[PDB]
Amino acid sequence: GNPLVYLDVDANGKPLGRVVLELKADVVPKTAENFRALCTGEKGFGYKGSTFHRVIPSFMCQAGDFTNHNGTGGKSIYGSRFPDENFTLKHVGPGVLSMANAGPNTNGSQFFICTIKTDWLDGKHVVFGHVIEGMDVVKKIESFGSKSGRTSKKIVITDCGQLS
Ligand SMILES: CCN1Cc2cc3c(cc2NCCC1=O)OCO3
Known part of the structure; x- marks a missing residue:
């Protein structure tokens, strides 16, 4: 019984599409629940309106800093x-x-979606799901990154929530 959640993402105020994620509540229920609730905004804060602030081609797309951006x-x-x-x-x-x-035991809201195998992070970062559909949208986000991580367009999670 794993949640399906979604992120709708813009680049410079224009839609890139939807990323659909499975959250592995079966393996990491506390970590899955955090992300699920941050997608729905049901605790009064969450990902809606925040950015992908660090995007590194051939590595990952990082988001979830909704306090400091x-x-x-x-x-x-x-x-x-x-x-x-x-x-x-x-x-x-x-x-x-x-x-x-x-470092150890410092999970908050920031997360990343990998665009390659990042096995050097095994045992150091908690994996809690994967892309079900919209990997093409992740590749669009990736294309606005750079080796420094700085984005060439403002990449915004305009909407997010739970599908099931
Ligand atoms: C560790 C300081 N800090 C903010 C923070 C910054 C991060 C991070 C996790 C967190 N944790 C949430 C609350 C907190 O204590 O991963 C990438 O940068």
């Missing part, structure tokens, strides 16, 4: 940060959804 912020539905739940799921390839962090 720059990679230094974000917060979970539980509090500012929560522990690493487990490292059972691995960074096996493109489309993996994983938590950004600033």
